[PDB]
Amino acid sequence: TCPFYKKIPGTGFTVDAFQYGVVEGCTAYFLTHFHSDHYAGLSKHFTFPVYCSEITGNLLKNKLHVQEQYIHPLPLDTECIVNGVKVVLLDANHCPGAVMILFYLPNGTVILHTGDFRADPSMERSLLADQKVHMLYLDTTYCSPEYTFPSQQEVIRFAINTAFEAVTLNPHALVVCGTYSIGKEKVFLAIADVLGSKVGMSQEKYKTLQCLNIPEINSLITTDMCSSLVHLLPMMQINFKGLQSHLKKCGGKYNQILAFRPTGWTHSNKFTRIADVIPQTKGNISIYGIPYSEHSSYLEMKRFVQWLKPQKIIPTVNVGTWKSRSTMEKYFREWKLEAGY
Ligand code: NI
């Protein structure tokens, strides 16, 4: 059974609610983004209308085989009428194709559902500037002040300078980057661009990237592993054993691996600056964990909500424990008292 924070009141709509069977009263199922916790339940046998971005619809058709007649892609930043209700999709600054949804209810209420997002001051000049929001369904993944991390631009600067130094010192070093979902593509694209190489990967991952509308993608990626000195591997292989095993397959072309594990936040963020980050090393293999987030930090979340001034907040993450719920409610009240709404 579908929980309340996935239903939009006064509509026949649900958001990210595919794992509950046929939901009673639902006439249109919205999907914010192509991550498995959110699409859990979709397949080629789904026969209800799915509303999403263009990029999410390419992934639904090619990767999950959903039939074309049930995929309803909407452009961004454009007022659209769905089953008699005005909606707008906005860029969520999460993974490719990820959106926030504005719903203009028949009774005059306005609801924003963030999906998953990384809040940014540029959202203060979208179509959100123009009108009031009564209810905010909020991605609360890092809603606590301990969750700090650098900008995506600082993280990418560190990765490019680290990779370019290592391969210039040793032209026979391979760079490997872990992945297990869409998102965070700038990590491996920025490293391959500084090295003058295409990125090499499996047929399965090539297929996925080919759905993402990245400009000039054919110039940037390949399935010919032998032609490339930046390889993608499943995240599970990014350890000393998996990397040893991979280096054997490369036919004596390389004598060293430098690997990157993009994570979200980790507790070593509570002590170490990005500049001071060091790898784990065993022999000719070194592994860097880098804190590349596609979710709001605490401070980015707080700024966004203090600007938007919603009347009510419904968290969509960390909802399963009383302690988490109480913590989040305390911060929402502080924010509101401090800003005066
Ligand atoms: Ni996500």
The C-alpha atoms of residue 45 and residue 26 are separated, in whole angstroms, by 17
The 28-30 sheet, strands edge to edge: 7-8, 13-15, 28-30, 50-52, 71-73
DSSP class per residue in 190-206: HHHHHHT-PEE--HHHH
Residue 9 CA to ligand 1 centre (angstroms): 23
Helix (H) / strand (E) containing 161:
helix 152-169
Which single residue is written with the structure tokens 């993280």?
155
Q: Say which amino acid occupies 320.
A: G
Residue 307 CA to ligand 1 centre (angstroms): 23
Residue 294 CA to ligand 1 centre (angstroms): 8
DSSP 189: H
Residue 107 CA to ligand 1 centre (angstroms): 31
The C-alpha atoms of residue 179 and residue 328 are separated, in whole angstroms, by 30
Token reading at 17: 């609610």
For residues 152 and 120, is the Cβ–Cβ distance under 8 A? no
Strand 221-222 relative to strand 110-113, pairing: unpaired
Residue 292 CA to ligand 1 centre (angstroms): 13
Nearest to 188 by CA among 237, 221, 223: 221
- Which whole-number Å values give the CA distances from 337 to 67, 205, 281, 309, in the listed order? 49, 47, 48, 11
Nearest to 198 by CA among 166, 175, 169: 175
For residues 230 and 188, is the Cβ–Cβ distance under 8 A? yes
Which single residue is written with the structure tokens 């990384």?
118
Residue 249 CA to ligand 1 centre (angstroms): 33
Nearest to 98 by CA among 66, 54, 140: 54
Residue 91 CA to ligand 1 centre (angstroms): 13
Give the three-class secondary structure for 179: strand
For residues 49 and 30, is the Cβ–Cβ distance under 8 A? no
The C-alpha atoms of residue 183 and residue 180 are separated, in whole angstroms, by 9
Nearest to 200 by CA among 213, 189, 186, 184: 189
209: Cβ–Cβ under 8 A, 6 or more apart, which residues? 185, 201, 217, 221
Give the chain's end-to-end CA distance (angstroms, integer): 35
This structure's resolution (Å) is: 1.2
Residue 320: count other Cβ atoms within 10 Å of its Cβ. Answer: 7
Nearest to 116 by CA among 135, 141, 89: 141
Residue 197 CA to ligand 1 centre (angstroms): 29
Residue 340 CA to ligand 1 centre (angstroms): 32
Q: Say which amino acid occupies 46.
A: F
The C-alpha atoms of residue 318 and residue 216 are separated, in whole angstroms, by 38
Nearest to 134 by CA among 179, 162, 103: 103
Q: Which residues pair with 314 in a beta bridge?
A: 137
Domains of the chain: 1-147+296-341 (3.60.15.10), 148-295 (3.40.50.12650)
- Which whole-number Å values give the CA distances from 1 to 20, 22, 41, in the listed order? 5, 9, 13
Mark residue 27 as left, alpha or beta (left: phi above 0; alpha: psi -120 to 50; beta: remaining): alpha
- Which whole-number Å values give the CA distances from 230 to 72, 78, 194, 294, in the listed order? 36, 38, 11, 22
Give the three-class secondary structure for 91: strand
Token reading at 74: 């909407």
Neighbours of ion ligand 1 (CB under 5 A): 35, 116
Residue 32 CA to ligand 1 centre (angstroms): 9
